[PDB]
Amino acid sequence: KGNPSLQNALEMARGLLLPVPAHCTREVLIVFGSLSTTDPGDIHQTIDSLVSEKIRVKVLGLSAQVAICKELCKATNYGDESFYKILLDETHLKELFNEAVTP
Amino acid sequence: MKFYIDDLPVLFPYPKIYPEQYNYMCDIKKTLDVGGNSILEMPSGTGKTVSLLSLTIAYQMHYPEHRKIIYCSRTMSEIEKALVELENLMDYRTKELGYQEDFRGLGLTSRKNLCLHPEVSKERKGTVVDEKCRRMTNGQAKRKLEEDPEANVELCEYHENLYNIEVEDYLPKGVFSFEKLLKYCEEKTLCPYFIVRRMISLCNIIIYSYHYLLDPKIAERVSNEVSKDSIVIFDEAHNIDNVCIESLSLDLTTDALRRATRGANALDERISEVRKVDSQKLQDEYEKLVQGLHSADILTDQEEPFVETPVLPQDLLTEAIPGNIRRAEHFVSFLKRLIEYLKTRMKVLHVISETPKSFLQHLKQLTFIERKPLRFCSERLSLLVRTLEVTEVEDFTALKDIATFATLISTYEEGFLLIIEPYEIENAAVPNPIMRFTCLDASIAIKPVFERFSSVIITSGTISPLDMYPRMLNFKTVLQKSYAMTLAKKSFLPMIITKGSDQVAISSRFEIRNDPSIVRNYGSMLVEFAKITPDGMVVFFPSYLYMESIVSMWQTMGILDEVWKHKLILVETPDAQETSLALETYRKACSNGRGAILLSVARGKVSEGIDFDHQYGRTVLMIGIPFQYTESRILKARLEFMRENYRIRENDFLSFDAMRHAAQCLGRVLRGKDDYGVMVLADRRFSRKRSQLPKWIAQGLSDADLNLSTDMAISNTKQFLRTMAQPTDPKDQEGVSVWSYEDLIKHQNSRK
Amino acid sequence: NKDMCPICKTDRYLSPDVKFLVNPECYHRICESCVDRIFSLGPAQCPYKGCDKILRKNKFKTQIFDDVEVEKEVDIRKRVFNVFNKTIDDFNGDLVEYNKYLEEVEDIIYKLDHGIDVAKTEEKLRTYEEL
Amino acid sequence: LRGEKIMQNDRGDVIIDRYLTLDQEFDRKDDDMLLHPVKKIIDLDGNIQDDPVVRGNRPDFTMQPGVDINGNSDGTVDILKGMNRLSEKMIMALKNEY
Ligand code: SF4
Ligand SMILES: [Zn+2]
Ligand SMILES: [Zn+2]
């Protein structure tokens, strides 16, 4: 239930990935189901902070291509727009989940 | 890239080019070699502006003629967008050629958008800004301060600093967009408006609006400085006829007539005071009018007339003042009795539609006012206001409308009609008369444009049908064609919704706006589309009153409460400032993923110029066909005029205008072939108007989508949004939808 | 008053019979009922206080303009333009002399309107109308 | 505040309604931190001010806000400004140090 908050999840993950050592890569996988998000603050500042902390975010969306998720993936993945993935059917969701286990 | 079209090297500022862009440049170069008018429907989404700018600059610099370029658009925002594209193009040209060539590019607009004076900046009207800038910079203030250094008059420092440096030394070479020009003129403490106005003859390319070429109140000074053998481009010209109607029209109210009587009495008091003090300042004007000197001979180049000339310069009489209005008191009495005759004519209980000749005959037989003194009314009023040296002009603003009416209705007698209505609005209890002098023939204002300039390139994103405009406006096209975009995947999915979810037919007719069921279907449609749209969504309405009623009663039943759960609601206010705040709030809400709906009129301010690309678009919800108010007398008179002269059917022209407004609002959503957005049309009457759509839109509209319901449209929209949410294959689009330089070379070799 | 006729002291509201019966000699707000009472017997002076010009009932008319000064200016223009009717073809296309004639007729209309030189201009008009 | 049209037949509450005019002042003060210059790309104010001396035909009543029998506004334009102000306030609340 509820209206999801991308910024709260990103801030919680940023707090979680802060004690991660430099050799260990910092990755976030967001399975985003909704099409709109309500944030308590500016999500672009959170995106810039995640870029400054070398945290790479991959988002699997359920309904359509959300622009803020695409911008977040492009900023965190050094301009790579291929890290925003949207399914087509049941097996495509299985393949997208099995694709994320690779480093 | 850099490529050759015949013998013309073209510097394209992108590493890839659309095939439609190359065909567009080929057609434009063929037209420029021919040197005639043409109409080209370059589809929206593709680079219509950048291709035009690149090819015309390449034609200007390479060919030894070096023809200047005029770029006329419909909105100042589109002027700024064209300036930005031109700045990018010349930055690319400087990078490729290694040097910045001798180039001048400036955008022209009013003083309100180009004022840096801290005092006259917050004025909400452009007329008071113009009158204050004139009051500080008429030259009379400067010579008064020179004679009396202790005088209370002040001078604008942004205008005086332009006197120290030359015209060519105002700005460095290059293109100056409005933001960059304002920043530079704030740094150097200069007036950007007077910088642009003095560099019209020096600019290789100059971009302004259709009002600065069609409306003779401001196009008189601009058209003199430009070259007659210059390239002329019309961008988004599909509504240009309205500008022509906007060029030579005037509405007079009884409040305006009362203020005109007050201004005439104030003018009589002023001329009585000046006659007592110094009659030499009147005697020199009187003998100059005796000698036959016109307004241009008496006025200096730096100052401007108090009343702008409302007629074409070719229609102005070259002979001297008739002498009934040569004496100042005689002209004041003439204007007063003209105003009283107008007040007599406004006391009517029914609509009177009369030709200007009949009005002139009635005025002569009732007031003994002839046409020839009326043709010099605005010039004589401006000369009298100049010679009176009035410090206040706010009391004489109503006299400008009377002078405009007198000069317009006397010179023009064919193609114009005078409408007097006892009720401006039928909802009001008290009668409010209004007198409308409207321009029925839109080809009158655009005729000197085609006469002066040989090559005119009319281009809009959704100009269709291409043969309607050469009949509407008297000009001949050497070639007219509409491009269809080559798409690897169906870039946009149009659909026509004729019935609701419960199969009830939906329409946006004005009389049935208060019907329950159609409003139920519209509200459920809007809620479902807001539930399925990811980023943002824009909804267009036929009129502002229809949108007001439907949104108010949607809030009454609580349709909007469900919309607030998904997307924020922003509505086009009549105030342009609050509308700009709503638009930038909509753009901010689409960027951060909050999601927003923007309600606007399909014929409003947001409909023209403003683009909704990528997340700003994604869904254009059309609530009905944007038809005009049929019961209005001006529209019926214009329809009768086009039926009488150009043999255009009234229903055909009404459908043409409504579908061209719908086409422009549908075309606002696309920028680039990577962009997508659905185009949903929620009216039963759209289905028969598939052929009236633009050609590129018509290819995307399948035959199965002509009578979709609400739920089928929602399912198709969800499937479409899921479909392009996948990444496209580059091999499917490597040389069919976008071309590299090698693909362009291969296509050129295949064409020969 | 614009609404009430002071000669009979009747408001337009409860007495709708009041009309704009003006006089070419001296323009006043006298209604038709006051006209049919005073001047049906014969000519008399102006019923308004401060004015006593002799007027006839058959010379009465209705005002076509809201302003009284504009109405009397237009009526003086009619009273001068009846004999002053030289056109461009009357001057055989002489544009400058036509402008001088228009200035002269506008000047004598102004002088008749403001009465600064009413006697001399009236004598000039009376000599011109005989020709 | 809910966007519903205000009618004089409702009793309201005499304690709360004392703030109504002050609330309108707050709405005015809302514009005091909402009105700001914008870019020329979306400058809709300058589009109608590009031609300053335009005096064309007045738009019909379909293109104008609705009026009552006496000519005064019916108040349906105020709820549009109300929801636009609410959207602008919710967007501006994101612009903080959080
Ligand atoms: S000269 Fe320029 S800056 Fe000064 S008041 Fe006029 S428009 Fe504004
Ligand atoms: Zn009376
Ligand atoms: Zn009298």
UniProtKB/Swiss-Prot annotation, chain A:
Compartments (UniProt record): Nucleus
Signal peptide: none
Extra facts: Present with 2340 molecules/cell in log phase SD medium.
Family statement drawn from the similarity comment of this UniProt entry: Belongs to the GTF2H2 family.
Function: Component of the general transcription and DNA repair factor IIH (TFIIH) core complex, which is involved in general and transcription-coupled nucleotide excision repair (NER) of damaged DNA and, when complexed to TFIIK, in RNA transcription by RNA polymerase II. In NER, TFIIH acts by opening DNA around the lesion to allow the excision of the damaged oligonucleotide and its replacement by a new DNA fragment. In transcription, TFIIH has an essential role in transcription initiation.
Oligomeric and partner information: Component of the 7-subunit TFIIH core complex composed of XPB/SSL2, XPD/RAD3, SSL1, TFB1, TFB2, TFB4 and TFB5, which is active in NER. The core complex associates with the 3-subunit CTD-kinase module TFIIK composed of CCL1, KIN28 and TFB3 to form the 10-subunit holoenzyme (holo-TFIIH) active in transcription. An additionnal subunit, TFB6, plays a role in the dissociation of the SSL2 helicase from TFIIH after transcription initiation.
Protein name as catalogued: General transcription and DNA repair factor IIH subunit SSL1
Originating organism: Saccharomyces cerevisiae (strain ATCC 204508 / S288c)
Residues of the full protein shown: 205 to 307 of 461
UniProtKB/Swiss-Prot annotation, chain B:
Main location (coarse class): nucleus
Keywords associated with the record: 4Fe-4S, ATP-binding, DNA damage, DNA repair, DNA-binding, Helicase, Hydrolase, Iron, Iron-sulfur, Isomerase, Metal-binding, Nucleotide-binding, Nucleus, Transcription, Transcription regulation
Cofactor binding notes: Binds 1 [4Fe-4S] cluster.
Record's protein name: General transcription and DNA repair factor IIH helicase subunit XPD/RAD3
InterPro entries: ATP-dep_Helicase_C, DinG/Rad3-like, DNA/RNA_helicase_DEAH_CS, HBB, Helic_SF1/SF2_ATP-bd_DinG/Rad3, Helicase-like_DEXD_c2, P-loop_NTPase, RAD3-like_helicase_DEAD
Organism from which the protein derives: Saccharomyces cerevisiae (strain ATCC 204508 / S288c) (Baker's yeast)
Molecular function via GO: 4 iron, 4 sulfur cluster binding; 5'-3' DNA helicase activity; ATP binding; ATP hydrolysis activity; ATP-dependent activity, acting on DNA; damaged DNA binding; DNA helicase activity; metal ion binding
GO annotations of cellular component type: cytosol; nucleotide-excision repair factor 3 complex; nucleus; transcription factor TFIIH core complex; transcription factor TFIIH holo complex
UniProtKB/Swiss-Prot annotation, chain C:
A GO-annotated cellular component: transcription factor TFIIK complex
Gene Ontology terms, MF aspect: cyclin-dependent protein serine/threonine kinase activator activity; zinc ion binding
The keyword Phosphoprotein belongs to this UniProt entry's keyword annotation: yes
Subcellular location: Nucleus
An annotated GO BP: DNA repair
Swiss-Prot/TrEMBL keywords: Metal-binding, Nucleus, Phosphoprotein, Transcription, Transcription regulation, Zinc, Zinc-finger
Zinc finger (RING-type): 5-52
Extra remark beyond the main annotation: Present with 3050 molecules/cell in log phase SD medium.
Function: Acts as a component of the general transcription and DNA repair factor IIH (TFIIH or factor B), which is essential for both basal and activated transcription, and is involved in nucleotide excision repair (NER) of damaged DNA. TFIIH has CTD kinase and DNA-dependent ATPase activity, and is essential for polymerase II transcription in vitro.
Assembly behavior: Component of the transcription factor IIH (TFIIH) holo but not the TFIIH core complex. Component of a complex consisting of KIN28, CCL1 and TFB3; the KIN28-CCL1 dimer is known as the TFIIK complex.
Protein name per Swiss-Prot or TrEMBL: RNA polymerase II transcription factor B subunit 3
UniProt lineage: Eukaryota, Fungi, Dikarya, Ascomycota, Saccharomycotina
Gene that this polypeptide is encoded by: TFB3
Span within the parent record: 9 to 139 of 321
UniProtKB/Swiss-Prot annotation, chain D:
Annotated signal peptide: none
Localization annotation: Nucleus
Additional note from the record: Present with 5150 molecules/cell in log phase SD medium.
Its job: Component of the general transcription and DNA repair factor IIH (TFIIH) core complex, which is involved in general and transcription-coupled nucleotide excision repair (NER) of damaged DNA and, when complexed to TFIIK, in RNA transcription by RNA polymerase II. In NER, TFIIH acts by opening DNA around the lesion to allow the excision of the damaged oligonucleotide and its replacement by a new DNA fragment. In transcription, TFIIH has an essential role in transcription initiation.
Quaternary structure and partners: Component of the 7-subunit TFIIH core complex composed of XPB/SSL2, XPD/RAD3, SSL1, TFB1, TFB2, TFB4 and TFB5, which is active in NER. The core complex associates with the 3-subunit CTD-kinase module TFIIK composed of CCL1, KIN28 and TFB3 to form the 10-subunit holoenzyme (holo-TFIIH) active in transcription. An additionnal subunit, TFB6, plays a role in the dissociation of the SSL2 helicase from TFIIH after transcription initiation. TFB1 interacts with XPC/RAD4. XPC/RAD4 recruits TFIIH to the NER machinery. Interacts with the NER 3'-endonuclease XPG/RAD2.
Similarity comment: family membership: Belongs to the TFB1 family.
Name of this protein: General transcription and DNA repair factor IIH subunit TFB1
Gene: TFB1
Portion of the parent chain present: 296 to 393 of 642
